[PDB]
Amino acid sequence: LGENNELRLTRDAIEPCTVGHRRYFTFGGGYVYFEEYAYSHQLSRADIT
């Protein structure tokens, strides 16, 4: 998953695993939420100020 619903084909986007990881990524018409490199849950636009 790239930026703005783009599908990248080369998985060369890596990173040294870190404690405290917590990220939202644009997915579909909303977001997807990962905590500690683990799929937490998808989340639609309305639930972010």
């Binding site: 939202y24 636009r45 972010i48 100020t49």
Partner: protein
């Protein structure tokens, strides 16, 4: 903890299609206040004593 997002584009007002006009010729009449006028002839004789 605190996480915000940018607002997305908006639906702009459609330009209204607009009025349609009928081309025509018009003659505007009003109430008549002029008296009917017609010429006549008077016949008489003045008398005196």
């Amino acid at each position: 903890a605190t996480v915000v997002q940018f607002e997305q584009p908006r639906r702009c007002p459609t330009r209204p299609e607009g009025q349609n006009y009928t081309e025509g010729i018009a003659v505007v009449f009003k109430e008549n206040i002029a008296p009917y006028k017609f010429k006549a002839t008077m016949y008489y004789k003045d008398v005196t004593v």
